[PDB]
Design a protein around this nucleic acid. Structure first.
Lengths: 69, 74, 97, 55, 126
RNA sequence: AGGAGUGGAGCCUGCGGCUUAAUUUGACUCAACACGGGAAACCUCACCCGGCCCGGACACGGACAGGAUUGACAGAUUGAUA
RNA sequence: AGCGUGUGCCUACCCUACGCCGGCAGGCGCGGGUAACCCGUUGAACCCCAUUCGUGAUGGGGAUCGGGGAUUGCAAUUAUUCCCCAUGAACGAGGAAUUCCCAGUAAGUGCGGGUCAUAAGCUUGCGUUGAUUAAGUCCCUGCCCUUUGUACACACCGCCCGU
């Protein structure tokens, strides 16, 4: 129904390209299982995702100070 | 700033030096019972390098100039 | 390491013409545009500078990332003797001092 | 002579490309109006360049 | 049932096209540096790869290498050669599948040695 | 007498340490704490890891013209031109 | 509107007007500007609305977690660059302790340089709205002066007594 392949969040990615956005966490589970893969492969970005350290460019000087372990 | 205790590795490393040459004898053999000249000069088609440049002795190799010409007998 | 004799002769003649040569210690530039076309790298400038410093035939002055040599009479004499140049070679222009 | 080891990473986009035109200082360089000066040297030769403290 | 997948494209289909097509038609990113062009004369690196594979045991993964440069992706016939983990000077033997080779950073382990940390205070204030 | 920041939420420079290859080079206040114009991708940090050198002028003094090779191509490099 | 920057020989390393490519970062061309010659009449912040938010935890909001992006220039890795697509931490004026504020001042925002290969929460200037508040005082914090005491003069971080 004429919605382009630029305005949506399942465009082709690792493994196989994702298609169809379904209700609720039908693909949010799909986009968290790739995060699970990233943690299971022992990658620097992946292990930093596992440890709770944001990676997209987030500095850390005051995060993780309230309610930390 | 000072010595960082680096004197035990490479115990006074020597500057690169392969061989020390006085005279060339085995490369000069013009004895054909006549005394005529015998040479093995081989050169690549160019102007910078000619027959004057010397050659590295090998069982099959022709080291000529800087162009890295490879011409082997397979 | 093998500092050329031909490059040395060219450098000596260039210095003798006017009394100064384009000297820099920067290595990011291999050859100065004036120093190019004659195989003159940074190390050549360094070696000439230090050899003339120990020799003392020219006095060195450093200012604003640049060097300047004071070509002396002893410098001219030694340059002639070691370059074996004719005796009537001397920078002696008089116009517009 | 050191040309086969240096020039291994071209230097034309960082603070190493720009240096003080007096003391080879790469800290606190002024690039306005092509000055290529550092603060200490600029204030050292401020009256000679033409700038005068009047405002 | 199914077959190996790599960013949507299939294994034999990886091996299908050329290297240049593999890089121009790959997923987003990792092509720009060689889109502009990585300089030629890469033959010595390929010969080092050949020597390492020859020294590698048969029916086994290629041994550790001491490379510091970020890798690339080519036909799957050889992609999978083990590249060690730079700790400070070593290259750890970690099973890195060809899906993670050529990606960001060659250190597939820790980068730093954490310091021993006490309670908040004493060691946190002067 | 009023207009705002915090022991009120995420981000920016400096200390008690980097047992990894690693800050040590300023301040117990105004008059240190978005300051060294300090927004180091590498280049500026030599700091930290085989970090090409003789490229440590000394003609010191001497054998010798070979006094010597700062080059690239291979088990002469598991780090393209180390 | 305001300050004002901009075609560079250590280097394509500028501001870019106009049309083409796409919702998009970006590429193409002709170029205008070495500048009161072009950007630029520098068309943002704002004031409007005879249609749509309504006291949430959210269209008052950000790692809106992860994937689509890329610069005629060494590779954006806890990636300081980046245009697209919901969720969420948190906050109901911030109990102590208090910065700084005399009229185009405080506050309300945007722009331009230094930053800069792209890079502003910083900083340095700039206009852009206009205030109930003050014509006072030593209460606090200081600082200065006068008188005064001193056994201090290395000058109270002084000197010095006794066990």
């Amino acid at each position: 129904y004429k919605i382009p392949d630029w305005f949506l969040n399942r465009q082709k990615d690792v493994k196989d390209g994702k298609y169809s956005q379904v209700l609720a966490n039908g693909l949010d589970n799909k986009l968290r299982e790739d995060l699970e893969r990233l943690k299971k492969i022992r990658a620097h970005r992946g292990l930093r995702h596992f440890w709770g350290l944001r990676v997209r460019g987030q500095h850390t000087k005051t995060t993780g100070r309230r309610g930390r372990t | 700033k000072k010595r960082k205790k680096k004197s035990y590795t490479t115990p006074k490393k020597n500057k690169h030096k392969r061989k020390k040459v006085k005279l060339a004898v085995l490369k000069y053999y013009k004895v054909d019972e006549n005394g005529k000249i015998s040479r093995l000069r081989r050169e690549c088609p160019s102007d910078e390098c000619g027959a004057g440049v010397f050659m590295a002795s090998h069982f099959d190799r022709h080291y000529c100039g800087k162009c890295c010409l490879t011409y082997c007998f397979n | 390491m093998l500092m050329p004799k031909k490059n040395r002769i060219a450098i000596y003649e260039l210095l003798f013409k006017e009394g100064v040569m384009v000297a820099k210690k920067d290595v990011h530039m291999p050859k100065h545009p004036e120093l190019a076309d004659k195989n003159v790298p940074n190390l050549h400038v360094m070696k000439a500078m230090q050899s003339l410093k120990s020799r003392g035939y020219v006095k060195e002055q450093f200012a604003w990332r640049h060097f300047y040599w004071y070509l002396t009479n002893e410098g001219i004499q030694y340059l002639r003797d070691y370059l074996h140049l004719p005796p009537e070679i001397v920078p002696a222009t008089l116009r517009r001092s | 002579g050191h040309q086969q080891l240096y020039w291994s990473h071209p230097r034309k986009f960082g603070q190493g490309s720009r240096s003080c035109r007096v003391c080879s200082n790469r800290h606190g360089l002024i690039r306005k109006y092509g000055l290529n000066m550092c603060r200490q040297c600029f204030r050292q030769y401020a009256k000679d360049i033409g700038f005068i403290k009047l405002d | 049932f199914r077959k190996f997948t790599y960013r949507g494209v299939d294994l034999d289909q990886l091996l299908d096209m050329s290297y240049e097509q593999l890089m121009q038609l790959y997923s987003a990113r990792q092509r720009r540096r060689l889109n502009r062009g990585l300089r030629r004369k890469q033959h010595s690196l390929l010969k080092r790869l050949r020597k390492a594979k020859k020294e590698a045991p048969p029916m086994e993964k290629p041994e550790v290498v001491k490379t510091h440069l970020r890798d690339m992706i080519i036909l799957p016939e050889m992609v999978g050669s083990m590249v060690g983990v730079y700790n400070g000077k070593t290259f750890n033997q970690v099973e890195i599948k060809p899906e993670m080779i050529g990606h960001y950073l060659g250190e597939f382990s820790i980068t730093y040695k954490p310091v021993k940390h006490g309670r908040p205070g004493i060691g946190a204030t002067h």
